[PDB]
């Protein structure tokens with residue numbers, strides 16, 4: 001209303017309605033693997049998704065969100081750089097028109113085909129709307145996708161996309177296990193940043209996994225058949241819904257691994 005990813009409403013325009021777009025702790029950023037310092041004081045992440053309760057999948061005109069029941073402490077993220085308990089509320093992806101672009105974070109300027117964002121809020125703030133107003137209010141676990149072998153645990157998501165083609169469509173999406181989207185290693189980089197879509201709030205501890213997951217060309221092709229537009233409107237394929245890397249400014253990216 002009315003930001004997006006086109007020439008006329010894309011990331012270069014966002015600052016006019018969201019001046020924080022040019023702030024001191026914007027996301028995503030380039031992760032320079034030769035400058036990120038190993039921090040032996042960081043903990044192992046704790047990803048506790050055994051009791052995750054998925055509910056619904058929604059095309060919101062910018063991406064699709066798989067939404068979770070976050071009414072109590074079911075699926076949580078703890079440890080690593082975090083203090084306290086962060087509840088999973090939704091996940092979504094950003095992806096490209098072609099395999100050579102699509103991720104938001106980059107690694108030594110490398111763009112991956114896509115990036116998964118598992119979004120969690122700090123339960124010391126009571127609700128999500130209060131958490132986004134706090135510098136430590138969110139933790140977003142970011143996972144790179146490369147194209148290769150299919151990811152079996154992604155197939156249930158790609159199979160429902162046909163039913164939520166256009167903006168505002170949703171579908172029942174219960175009993176989905178987000179553990180099937182994780183890579184084997186939980187080695188990560190961490191830095192303080194922001195939501196990567198308007199309102200671009202500076203409320204996120206970013207935790208970006210080093211190990212990408214592999215998805216097949218057919219899987220990511222099915223992402224690219226979604227529409228940014230509503231039913232009956234001229235078709236605009238949902239592709240290139242990523243914000244480019246933003247200035248690092250006065251921030252250090254820390255590595256969990258040597």
Ligand SMILES: CCCCCNC(=O)c1ccc(S(N)(=O)=O)cc1
Pocket residue numbers: 117119128129132140194195196197198199
């Ligand atoms: C209550 C404020 C409404 C904000 C609506 N926006 C989000 O809840 C949001 C979540 C995650 C990300 S991301 N791409 O950085 O993971 C971006 C935006």
Ligand SMILES: [Zn+2]
Pocket residue numbers: 092093094117196
């Ligand atoms: Zn995102």
